[PDB]
Write a protein that binds this ligand. Structure first.
Ligand code: NAD
Ligand code: NAD
Ligand code: A1H1H
Ligand code: A1H1H
Lengths: 257, 258
């Protein structure tokens, strides 16, 4: 496969419905060796199990709210790996109450700060902590974004501001690290029913809307997202950096439907 | 590889420097079976010889000025192949004098009409002619664009208008064909010293500028473009349609490079 020899760290894999699971599966299918992070101690067993099915025993606790925890991942991983070829950012969070209802009524300073720190700052923070292991390796970062970065969407509210910050982060990270042989790209995925859809009322209606309106007349899968991530983590994509690739079956490019 | 057994028709391969040659070599490396077009009789032997080195003896004349020739390609190819999995558009042309100097002084009606017919109309025209063969196969189209579509660039002049038309054509073709299982995407490549650069003055200066300013601090290769095309032609990219992907080492996303 086209990721033979690559060693890739994957964040955000919490269940088999996670986008990060689709990414991990697609990467392992292409020959990569994987390592994983998980946010709280409570999740360790589930993540070790999924990791084991993908032939990995390399699992590390990481709350991206914590500079120390982020740094410790790379310290620990560096004892097993000579370097890091791929880094997958698949972390997005805002307080649930900020993701329902009128944008201004639902926003607060605290929710804004949390959403941006966890969903956007985490990309430069991870890239910076990974830099010693990634520099000079012709390596690559992939982060997951969503249409709310560039379009107003009902209920997505402050997460759209956070995604816009993330996508600018992708550009600035790519501009910073390209000379030393690290690429940084985004995927803007169409909606997928993961654990992110939990408590998001009418997610089903969103899915039906996208499948009724997009060129492919269907919703995307975690496999389709994951195969695109695999490509972006591979040397096949060596001419691409700072890019946001839409894996939404063409949804964003249609109007007047 | 990930195009094993896929049948792909490639336009625009005229030398080993061509973008289309990079795409061909990348697709063959992933297992595809290839077929090729050439614009005029003068080129037939060169392209047949290149094709043979890529394990193909399927080569067809096609000047995209001619609807007869465009549709004749697929009639002839259809005698060999029961269907088509991939279609590569790597064709761009404007009169040389329209590509030098002041945009308005250099433009003319004839040059505008030629640039748009050859460089933009040829994408829907080829997609339309290929539709019967490509239908229902989870097949894919890839076309080459350039940053002039979306940014003003010295000397590129009317070709920028033609590339804008082309990129809209990619979106409209994607929206048209998606229900029938055909995807259509673009690659916006960084500058490359192909035969296209011949007769373009100071092309080396343009290359130097891009390598000085882009995130990667280097120009891209036809191999990099080709591997992206291979991905976009494959089922790995089945969630992507109507997209323009920049293979320019990040050049387009940088500013204020002093
Ligand atoms: N599901 C969709 O429709 C969709 C579409 C496009 C983009 N996205 C984005 O894709 C990414 C993955 O989401 P998903 O849908 O797979 O959901 P998911 O809930 O499976 O994954 C989100 C992950 O973020 C992690 N996370 C949250 N806070 C964290 C913290 N402080 N530190 C570390 N990890 C933390 C969670 O533990 C979880 O693993 C997110 O960035 C999301 O915004 C989702
Ligand atoms: N070289 C660059 O810097 C660059 C960067 C981005 C995009 N592009 C685009 O890539 C494509 C391929 O160009 P290239 O750089 O590989 O140069 P090239 O000269 O190798 O290929 C151009 C091709 O266009 C064909 N063509 C011209 N008029 C035609 C006609 N009437 N019918 C059929 N074919 C015709 C030529 O015969 C040739 O094969 C073009 O669309 C070009 O605009 C080039
Ligand atoms: C699409 C789409 C998505 C799916 N999507 C594109 C996302 O980025 C989701 C992000 C998200 C962030 N924080 C959460 C989320 C999801 N969900 C539950 C509640 C989680 O436990 C939590 O407490 N915070 O999320 C939406 C939210 C509103 C409107 C549309 C969408
Ligand atoms: C980059 C860049 C490119 C390279 N590029 C991105 C192109 O699309 C080139 C297009 C092209 C079209 N018609 C031609 C061309 C090139 N060259 C010779 C003369 C050919 O034989 C002919 O008679 N017409 O071309 C440029 C032209 C001007 C400014 C910048 C660029």
């Amino acid at each position: 496969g086209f990721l033979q020899g690559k060693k890739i760290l994957i964040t955000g894999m919490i269940s088999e419905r996670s986008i990060a699971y689709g990414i991990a599966k697609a990467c392992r299918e292409q020959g990569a060796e994987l390592a994983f992070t998980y946010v709280v101690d409570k999740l360790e067993e589930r993540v070790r199990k999924m990791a084991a099915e993908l032939d990995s025993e390399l699992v590390f606790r990481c709350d991206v709210a914590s500079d120390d925890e982020i740094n410790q991942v790379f310290a620990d991983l560096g004892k097993h790996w000579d370097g890091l070829d791929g880094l997958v950012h698949s972390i997005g969070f805002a307080p649930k109450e900020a993701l329902s209802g009128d944008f201004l009524d639902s926003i607060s300073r605290e929710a804004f700060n949390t959403a941006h720190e966890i969903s956007a700052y985490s990309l430069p923070a991870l890239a910076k902590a990974a830099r010693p292991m990634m520099r000079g390796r012709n390596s690559a970062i992939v982060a997951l974004s969503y249409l709310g970065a560039v379009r107003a969407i009902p209920n997505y509210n402050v997460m759209g501001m956070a995604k816009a910050s993330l996508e600018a982060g992708i550009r600035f990270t790519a501009a910073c690290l390209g000379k030393e042989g690290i690429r940084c790209n985004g995927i803007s995925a169409g909606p997928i029913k993961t654990l992110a859809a939990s408590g998001i009322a009418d997610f089903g209606k969103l899915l039906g809307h996208v499948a009724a309106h997009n060129p492919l007349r269907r919703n995307v899968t975690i496999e389709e997202v994951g195969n695109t991530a695999a490509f972006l983590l591979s040397d096949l994509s060596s001419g691409i950096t700072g890019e946001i690739t839409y894996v939404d079956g063409g949804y964003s490019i249609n109007a007047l439907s």
